[PDB]
Design a protein around this ligand. Structure first.
Ligand SMILES: N[C@H](Cc1ccccc1)[C@H](O)C(=O)O
Ligand SMILES: N[C@H](Cc1ccccc1)[C@H](O)C(=O)O
Ligand SMILES: [Mn+2]
Ligand SMILES: [Mn+2]
Ligand SMILES: [Mn+2]
Ligand SMILES: [Mn+2]
Lengths: 441, 441
């Protein structure tokens, strides 16, 4: 739960206020200014059946408020330069006839008390801001292209956006500025990510421990998800990959419903969300507990590639540089393994991209593919968090590879915090040396 | 998992052909005729992360094909009356560069071999049907208002639909005719629903068996879902309700993230999908294994109401009649329990609706709220499947109820097949008598 002063676990009112300050500092670099960020709605599986609520992550990042159908406004102060501003929440009025179904919601006074924003009003009072926002002298920052909340957009912001679009001061997108902030984690955010990584690591360990041969993919999925949730994870962070044998070579395999035979490996990519931050981990292991000789050759190859790429996660290198290194190292291993017979086959990285068709990694945070418009060519800085997830995939019908490798796929994925010196591996507790894996099984 | 001749487990090629025959017979009762049903797409959590595929249920009902981005067409035959027709599947051409990611897909010959439709072609050949379908002499049956697949609709059927909308022969909806068929289950469908009900009943039993106090809602959720999936359930059928203590009175409680204390009950509404059909079961029990005296009084009242309503599930009665009975019986129990002090309080069922604000039940089948446009005033017929789910809910702040009942909510929900005589309770294996519950906990 929450320590005094916390809005969400580990994250204080002042930390949220400092995020808002930094956003208004970014806007100042770009008369009156207004930022509008919508919350998520409640989504429905069918007309009378709701899904569990998940907040919009940009809304959540800036104020920590975990209820639907709300609007955050940051407004410049008359006679003061940015980054001075006030933060205002607009929330639904209390409605007992709806709380019977959906549960209690915050008052305006409750929203202020929890979050520490300056002011709060009901949604119906948002209209009083719109005349001033409509003026050609008012710069409005709002993500109108793909609104987070279709009805809030339609009712409260689409007329404003269309009115300003025919003016000299059009609405400007803001989510790309929020991404710049989410790119650099605070110590408190790193601690949240560490907790998620340790919890997920334990879920992997228990799933390896109960591995047997043969075993259903659906059972390993069920066990993994049970262990995450029983350990306090709120949700899984993405649909897991639980891909056995040759299905490990299907890169977006999520159906997880086939039997894994004795002598096959499972590729299990699984992560969870805890206190608003995620993990994203992949391990490959033999379900009977013992690597075969070709499985061990291939696995150790990927582990050595991953080791070398993890050592590059220091300030100044970029994900793009690390991807270049990965493809170079994959080419070396394909030669060593006898998969690549002629060195020229990795011209333009052709062989390496054939055997690892995906990138080396991505930014990680409140989302799995965190801040996706931030370039992978950016130099890494302390506080950025990335994955490193090389793999090598040899389809069973790949007659250009040695027969002993056909039908084997391996990926090893860890989550990494860049620091001033050595990277912090959030997923360090999750075994990946072959001897450690065989000991657990 | 398929016997020879089966398209999906338990459902033969000829059973699917007979559903198509019956649909064309319904259309005959309403020159050439064409029925178009789109499949579902692959949905994405974010740009590069797919969810597990689930077929559109109307498409699935009519042909059993479990792959995305496809179109089913039923076409009248020249010079022959309905219900004679041909069934055609249009499927994506195979594409190795996409199969690397999503896995193998069926050929046209594969789709025909699996399903038993008459013909199959790739999507690029769908265009050859459109000139004849656009003709004013061609009646087209197609659900355009909320398309199952936005992109297939935009690319393949929206131009046709708009052209006919500007003609004397507009496109006619068809999903309401499919609902009329899905309303009456075949013996093979009833067997699938029985399997889903037994599996779910076992997951409840396991969750009761390890119940303890205190216990986290999230843990009971994790345990229930594990037990369903471990037994082969494909997915949960809806977000479960795992609501302890006074939260049992929040009717759409799905957050499932609070502690249930010693002396409190849990209301657990959970169901799964197995071989394309769902269950929908609610049980309420004390997490410490022993009903208190007021919990027992309230629980036995709801059980008695439910027993009486289940006994009304015979041909000729309607869901609306059973709802009327439920409200009448609730009024009797509120009086007996001392919640309702004056008999006139159930004038217009006012008190009963206060204490049970939801309906007695709904149709059940491939969907949880199955065939939702079929009237609840229809007389029940053999083969219809419904739920019966009365409850009584006493908020902790309800000062008009005796103090001993405040903060208690009870619902008991079973799934029922109407037969020529007495109903078949699909969920009969799931204990609900108080003695049976206490023995299992
Ligand atoms: N687990 C993630 C996302 C994912 C992709 C496809 C299926 C399931 C999850 C993977 O590491 C990635 O960064 O692409
Ligand atoms: N379990 C279902 C659907 C459901 C509703 C609300 C939350 C979760 C599930 C419930 O019996 C009903 O028929 O309404
Ligand atoms: Mn991953
Ligand atoms: Mn990843
Ligand atoms: Mn239910
Ligand atoms: Mn129900």
């Amino acid at each position: 739960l929450l320590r005094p002063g916390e809005v969400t676990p580990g994250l204080s009112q002042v930390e949220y206020a400092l995020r808002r300050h930094k956003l208004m500092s970014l806007i100042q670099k770009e008369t009156d200014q207004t930022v509008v960020v919508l919350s998520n709605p409640t989504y429905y599986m069918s007309n009378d059946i709701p899904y569990t609520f998940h907040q919009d992550n940009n809304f959540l990042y800036l104020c920590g408020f975990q209820e639907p159908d709300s609007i955050l406004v940051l407004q410049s102060l008359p006679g003061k330069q940015l980054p001075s501003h006030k933060a205002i929440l607009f929330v639904p009025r209390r409605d007992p006839s709806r709380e019977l179904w959906d549960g209690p919601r915050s008052g305006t006074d409750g929203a202020i008390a929890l979050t520490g924003v300056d002011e709060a009003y009901t949604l119906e009072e948002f209209q009083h801001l719109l005349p001033k926002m409509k003026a050609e002298t008012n710069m409005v920052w709002y993500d109108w292209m793909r609104p987070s909340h279709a009805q809030l957009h339609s009712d409260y912001m689409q007329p404003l956006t269309e009115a300003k679009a025919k003016s000299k001061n059009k609405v400007r997108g803001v989510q790309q500025l929020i991404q710049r902030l989410r790119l650099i984690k605070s110590p408190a955010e790193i601690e949240r990510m560490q907790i998620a990584g340790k919890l997920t690591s334990q879920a992997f360990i228990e799933t390896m421990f109960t591995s047997k041969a043969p075993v259903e993919e659906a059972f390993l999925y069920a066990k993994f998800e049970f262990e995450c949730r029983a350990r306090g994870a709120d949700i899984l962070a993405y649909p897991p990959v639980v891909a056995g044998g040759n299905r490990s070579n299907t890169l977006h395999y999520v159906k997880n419903n086939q039997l894994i035979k004795d002598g096959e490996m499972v590729l299990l990519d699984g992560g969870c969300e805890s206190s608003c931050y995620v993990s994203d981990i992949t391990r490959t292991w033999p379900v009977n507990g013992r690597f075969t000789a070709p499985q061990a050759e291939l696995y150790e190859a990927v582990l050595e590639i991953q080791r070398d790429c993890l050592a590059l996660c220091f300030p100044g290198t970029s994900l793009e540089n690390i991807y270049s290194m990965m493809l170079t190292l994959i080419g070396q291993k394909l030669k060593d393994l006898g998969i690549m017979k002629n060195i020229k086959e990795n011209n333009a990285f052709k062989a390496a991209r054939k055997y690892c068709p995906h990138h080396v990694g991505h930014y990680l945070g409140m989302d799995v593919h965190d801040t996706p418009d931030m370039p992978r060519s950016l130099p890494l800085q302390p506080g950025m968090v990335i994955t490193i997830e090389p793999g090598i995939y040899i389809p069973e019908d790949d007659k250009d590879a040695p027969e002993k490798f056909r039908g084997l796929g391996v990926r090893i994925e860890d989550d990494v915090v860049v620091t001033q010196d050595s990277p912090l591996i959030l997923s360090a507790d999750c075994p990946k040396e072959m001897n450690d894996i065989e000991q657990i099984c």
